[PDB]
Design a protein around this ligand. Structure first.
Ligand SMILES: [Mg+2]
Lengths: 165, 65
């Protein structure tokens, strides 16, 4: 969910795709990710084109984590549950907001909730598309490269916009 | 659709760069891959360039992915 400009918007919803409308100048994306009974991430990112390449540059700050919580204690399974991202316009910032819940699987069979609140605003001056309410349906598959000795993650994701007929 | 949508009709290369600080544990991640919005499809590989990531990879997917 860092480069939501790669979502598939169905043709009948294309007037609701803020993310691509902000390109190439791009958008700022900010989140607060609150891990239930643990700490939080605050993130600020700028997503924009640099020539023909889509670039996502992020600063992440995490505070108030428990030293042997699920996060700093590495108690989460290496997998990822499908979910929806619920988008609404923020006319006042000429942008969008989103809210959604991520449920990480704990190795003991339980779940670690990560509440997400998100705000996006354009970097450029050109007109953008302010959407009606809708959601992004996301699926992500996490894997490893068997020849990579560095700490890493291989990700395959599919995302489709939905919720308007 | 918008003018910007025209930039996404084919495969677009992606670069991701993250600097992080979680409870004082500092780290950086670099990612590379490509997106094909026609199919809603993203393929990315991330490397922690500072050593061991001090948080689980899944907790960064919404930020990095
Ligand atoms: Mg309407």
């Amino acid at each position: 969910a860092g480069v939501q400009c790669f979502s598939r918007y169905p043709d009948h919803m294309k007037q609701h795709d803020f993310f691509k409308s902000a390109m190439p100048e791009g958008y700022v994306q900010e989140r607060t990710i609150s891990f239930k009974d643990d700490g939080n991430y605050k993130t600020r990112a700028e997503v924009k084109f640099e020539g023909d390449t889509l670039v996502n540059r992020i600063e992440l700050k995490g505070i108030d984590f428990k030293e042997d919580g699920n996060i700093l204690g590495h108690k989460l399974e290496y997998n990822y549950n499908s979910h929806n991202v619920y988008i609404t316009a923020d006319k006042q910032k000429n942008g969008i907001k989103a809210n959604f819940k991520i449920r990480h699987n704990i190795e003991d069979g339980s779940v670690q909730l990560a509440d997400h609140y998100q705000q996006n605003t354009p970097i450029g001056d050109g007109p953008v598309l302010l959407p009606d309410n809708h959601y992004l349906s996301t699926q992500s598959a996490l894997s490893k490269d068997p020849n990579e000795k560095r700490d890493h993650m291989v990700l395959l994701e599919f995302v489709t916009a939905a919720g308007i007929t | 659709a918008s003018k910007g949508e025209e930039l996404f009709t084919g495969v677009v290369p992606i670069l991701v760069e993250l600097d992080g600080d979680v409870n004082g544990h500092k780290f950086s991640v670099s990612g590379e891959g490509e997106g094909d919005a026609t199919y809603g499809k993203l393929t990315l590989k991330f490397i922690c360039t500072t050593g061991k990531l001090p948080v689980p990879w899944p907790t960064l997917v919404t930020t990095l992915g």
